Amino acid sequence: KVFGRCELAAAMKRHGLDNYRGYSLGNWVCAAKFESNFNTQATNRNTDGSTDYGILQINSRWWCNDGRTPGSRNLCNIPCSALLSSDITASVNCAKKIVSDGNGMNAWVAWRNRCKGTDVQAWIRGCRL
Ligand SMILES: [Cl-]
Ligand SMILES: [Cl-]
Ligand SMILES: [Cl-]
Ligand SMILES: [Cl-]
Ligand code: NA
Ligand SMILES: [Re]
Ligand SMILES: [Re]
């Protein structure tokens, strides 16, 4: 599915990502925009042979099992393909685990480079929430 901005913000809020570990909702919407263009089906292969998956481009080296990244972990205990659903449940639950592990949202390159230190509340402006 390709989400609307306010459509995504409302789902993410329902899933408890507003202010999770300090991160207001706009941070998660911005990160999704720039990682996946709001597309749940987006996949991208990396130079090490892992693959990024889903609306938040969660990587197979450590977080999911895609059966094709050798020497990898599956710390969220899910097939990587679950991160491609239009239900964003598997992505949000595994993003919570990711954000909790030490670097916060710095774990996402596009958030660090494109959302950190910007007015991220603009990403939810004028949304019924
Ligand atoms: Cl916000
Ligand atoms: Cl893409
Ligand atoms: Cl694997
Ligand atoms: Cl943090
Ligand atoms: Na893996
Ligand atoms: Re909903
Ligand atoms: Re809500």
Q: DSSP labels for 59-84?
A: ETTTT-B-S--TT---TT-SBGGGGG
End-to-end Cα spacing for the chain: 20
What resolution, expressed in A, was reported for this entry? 2.2
Q: Residues 6 or more apart from 52 whose CB is under 8 A from it?
A: 35, 42, 43, 44, 45, 46, 58, 59, 60
Find out whether 84 and 41 touch, Cβ atoms under 8 Å.
yes
Of 7, 18, 35, 48, the active-site residue reads: 35
Hey, is 38 helix, strand or coil? Answer: coil
Residues at the binding site for substrate are 101
Q: Residues 6 or more apart from 41 whose CB is under 8 A from it?
A: 1, 54, 84
**What kind of fold does domain 1-129 have according to CATH?**
Lysozyme (1.10.530)
Please tell me the distance from the alpha carbon of residue 128 to that of residue 91, in angstroms, as a whole number.
23
Is 7 annotated as catalytic?
no
Method for structure elucidation? X-ray
Domain segments of the chain as ranges = 1-129
Q: How far is the CA of 17 from the centre of ligand 5 (A)?
A: 24
Is 52 annotated as catalytic?
yes
Please tell me the distance from the alpha carbon of residue 105 to that of residue 116, in angstroms, as a whole number.
9
| The pair of three-digit structure tokens given for residue 128, joined into one six-digit string | 């019924």
Q: Which ligand is nearest to the CA of 19?
A: 1
